[PDB]
Each structure stands twice: as C-alpha cells, then as structure tokens.
C-alpha cells in the first residue's frame, strides 16, 4: 500500500488475501477435527467418570 | 455474459467460479463433519436402545 497505487496495489492486496484467507480455512478445518477427537474423549471421560 | 465478450468475460466468471467452488467446499466440508457427530450420536442412541 505504501508503494503500489490502488490499481496496481489491488491485484497485490488480493493475492495476500487468497492466500492468508486459504491458511484460515486450512487452520478451522484442522480445528474442527481436531474437536472432534477431544469432543470424543471428553465423552469417553464423561463415561468412565 | 450479457455485457463482456468470451476474452473478458472468462476471466471474469473464473473469479466466480473460483469463490463459489471454495464456498461449496467449505460447506462440503463442514457438512461432513456434522455428518460424523450425528454419526456418533445416532451409534449412541443405538446402544441406547
């Protein structure tokens, strides 16, 4: 933003933006898996409790 | 369509066919996950019965 005008530095911004926002989806992917495995041994706690 | 040429108009429908293949990904995605905890609790209830 600092050395690119807003047409030039629009097609940069949003080569960032595709990547960083690709990365979210990869990390809440994992995350919400994740949870699932945590979520499944709290239940089996939850049981042996 | 209606308003771009093949040349600029493909460019521009690939932008959209680019965020509405991620956003049906996305929801693939997450739709399998609920699917594995409706999975989990019907083999639950299952045992239940």
Redesign the interface.
């Known amino acids: 933003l600092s050395r690119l005008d807003k047409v030039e530095a629009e097609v940069q911004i949003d080569r960032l933006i595709t990547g960083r926002l690709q990365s979210l989806?990869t990390y809440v992917?994992q995350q919400?898996?994740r949870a699932?495995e945590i979520?499944?041994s709290a239940?089996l706690a939850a049981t042996k409790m």
Chains 1, 2 share one sequence.
Do not use: E
């Open positions: 989806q992917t919400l898996i699932a979520r499944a239940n």
